[PDB]
Amino acid sequence: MPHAFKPGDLVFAKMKGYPHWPARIDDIADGAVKPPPNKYPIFFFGTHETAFLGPKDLFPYDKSKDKYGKPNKRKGFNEGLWEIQNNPHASYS
């Protein structure tokens, strides 16, 4: 059975105006800015951007890849598909 989201989990993350996007739950470094309550720090593959999202916008990658893991014209998306498949736990800093 599923647990709550934890750092390192792989997802597609949804935001307004964007397609479901390959991403991971990040850690928060010692000393760095924490998310709002009930929100997780999401690192978006390809764009390497971070936003704060709740579980309603997080789709576990294994279940969802057949639907959402196809090429997209949007900037950074296809690089992001490569990253989540090939090195999803690397430093992209």
Swiss-Prot record:
Residues 7-64 form the PWWP domain. Acts as an epigenetic regulator of myogenesis in cooperation with DPF3a (isoform 2 of DPF3/BAF45C). Associates with the BAF complex via its interaction with DPF3a and HDGFL2-DPF3a activate myogenic genes by increasing chromatin accessibility through recruitment of SMARCA4/BRG1/BAF190A (ATPase subunit of the BAF complex) to myogenic gene promoters. Promotes the repair of DNA double-strand breaks (DSBs) through the homologous recombination pathway by facilitating the recruitment of the DNA endonuclease RBBP8 to the DSBs. Belongs to the HDGF family. It is found in: Nucleus; Cytoplasm. The gene is HDGFL2. Widely expressed. High expression is found in heart, skeletal muscle, ovary and testis. Overexpression is frequently observed in hepatocellular carcinoma samples. Interacts with HDGF. Interacts with trimethylated 'Lys-36' of histone H3 (H3K36me3). Interacts with trimethylated 'Lys-79' of histone H3 (H3K79me3), but has higher affinity for H3K36me3. Interacts with IWS1. Interacts with H2AX, POGZ, RBBP8 and CBX1. Interacts with histones H3K9me3, H3K27me3 and H3K36me2. Interacts with DPF3a (isoform 2 of DPF3/BAF45C). Interacts with SMARCA4/BRG1/BAF190A, SMARCC1/BAF155 and SMARCD1/BAF60A in a DPF3a-dependent manner. The chain holds residues 1 to 93 of 671 of the full protein. This is Hepatoma-derived growth factor-related protein 2.
